[PDB]
Design brief:
Three copies of one chain form a homotrimer. Chain A is an alpha/beta fold and about 190 residues long. Chain A has a single domain (about 1-190), classed as P-loop containing nucleotide triphosphate hydrolases (Rossmann fold, 3-Layer(aba) Sandwich). Chain A is about 50% helix and about 20% strand. Chain A has helices spanning about 15-30, 40-50, 65-80, 105-110, 125-135, 140-160, 175-185; strands at about 5-10, 35, 85-90, 95, 100, 115-120, 165-170. In chain A, the strands form two sheets. In chain A, strands 2-3-1-6-7 form a five-stranded parallel sheet, sandwiched between helices. Chain A has a two-stranded antiparallel ribbon with strand order 4-5. Chains in contact: A-B, A-C, B-C. The interface of A and C includes residues 93 and 99 of A. Bound molecules: chloride ion (7 copies). One chloride ion (CL) binds near residues 176, 178 and 179 of chain B. One chloride ion binds next to helix 7 of chain A. Chain C: Keywords: ATP-binding, Cytoplasm, Kinase, Nucleotide-binding, Transferase. Chain C: Belongs to the archaeal adenylate kinase family. Chain C: Its EC number is 2.7.4.3. Chain C: It comes from Methanotorris igneus.
Chain lengths: ~190, ~190, ~190
């Protein structure tokens, strides 16, 4: 009965902060959503098996054991959903030097079974300027638009394989409060 | 041997009237296409199995049996396909308040086995202007939202093509040029 | 372990010629990639199978066996990968008169198991001027060409979701062809 919701967006789009604010407002109203990050959920599982001590060591792992941890992360999130509604911060695609890599390949969706995929969007201009303010980080607006394109294709495909609705929310400067209200609204 | 064709489009783009026009001129040539609406096939399937008596009572059934109605609906159209070519009027994605919902999830595709996905498009301007004319719109939103829906529909239709092998055909249904779109679809089916 | 790479692009973008330069420079560095054409793997598979003697007969076989040929092509390319890295030149989608046709439908991906899907792109203007120059083009517009680049993206991303292959876009721009090669050599590391 409890919902599984995935929140995605490119670095700098502000989707993590948006979800934290939404859960706070859902809790004023008595609706508990537990927030997790899919990637540290994978890191946690790999430490459980003695596979790592360091988080940089993750992307030096073989493609098989990395496919199994992905599976255990989704199943593990599937387990938390018996005890609370779950909101998962993850990438629709990771922009890697080798190309766009789906954050939820089919073997992860079959275990996770989301009810909603959220795509958090804004203009390339607003995204690139946020990045420059972040003292912890250079790529330009065309590469940012390309990524927001490929993220859309990946989430719609997730929707075709899982049955989740795919919801696009705009997170615009001066209007972050509007993004919260629509996301609260989606989940009620 | 018979073909199963899916025709898709956002509300107001005229794909239904395009389809009915194409079906009528094809029959003049000795080609039978039966036209069905995927949403009414789901209603009919849920009635036979005792699940409902009303077409509104369906969007209050649990998502599990509602997924089974979907699976059976795709199966029923492939059954109709032993007897005629079949054209299915359906949304590539339905734009719901909760987000875009795929009109043919994989479990439907596994039974439907479509041969062609047609995406009927035009400019968001014409779509909004057609919609405003319809006094049967109090639930129809801006052109940027219309452009977004035609985007997601393309991504969903190509995924159907990747998972089924159906070719995905884009037809432009423009004001003053409706007759050209019909003729291009007739050509697609010949 | 050897990697299998799919290289894609609309006609006239130069994805084929980009690959011949890259495989040629990779070997100077001691890295062997074998280049194959997915459609010629299919033709060769069917010739053993008594199904054809002529490429004329291929686009006239029944749709069950021609899916079966598709699958055996994916398997056979996956077999070549036991002995060397394999680079597969194919269409992410084929623009046919009936619409866009995926070049790696799901049943092929399950057998081919690519590691990288590469999309070669440039402006529709550059693509269209190349096409007119080629006297080996036997008519379509810049809008039709961009629509094809759009669907190829939707398909290629779909491959990554189903397989875990990375989807990489390389721009192959006029006056900057040598720049595109360097990016692809880099991809192959
Ligand atoms: Cl995004
Ligand atoms: Cl604000
Ligand atoms: Cl559409
Ligand atoms: Cl309509
Ligand atoms: Cl007209
Ligand atoms: Cl090519
Ligand atoms: Cl070329």
């Amino acid at each position: 009965k409890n919902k599984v919701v995935v929140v995605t967006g490119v670095p700098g789009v502000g989707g993590t902060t948006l979800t934290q604010k939404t859960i706070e407002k859902l809790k004023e109203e008595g609706i508990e959503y537990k927030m997790v990050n899919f990637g540290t959920v994978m890191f946690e599982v790999a430490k459980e098996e003695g596979l790592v001590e360091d988080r940089d060591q993750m992307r030096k792992l073989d493609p098989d054991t990395q496919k199994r941890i992905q599976k255990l992360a989704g199943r593990k999130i599937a387990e938390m959903a018996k005890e609370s509604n779950v909101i998962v911060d993850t990438h629709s695609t990771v922009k890697t030097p080798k190309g766009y890599l789906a954050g939820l390949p089919i073997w992860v969706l079959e275990e996770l079974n989301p009810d909603i995929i959220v795509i958090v969007e804004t203009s390339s201009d607003e995204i690139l300027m946020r990045r420059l303010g972040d003292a912890t980080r250079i790529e330009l607006t065309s590469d940012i638009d390309e990524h927001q394109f490929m993220n859309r294709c990946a989430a719609m495909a997730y929707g075709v394989l899982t049955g989740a609705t795919v919801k696009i929310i705009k997170n615009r400067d001066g209007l972050l409060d509007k993004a919260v209200e629509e996301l609260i609204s989606v989940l009620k």
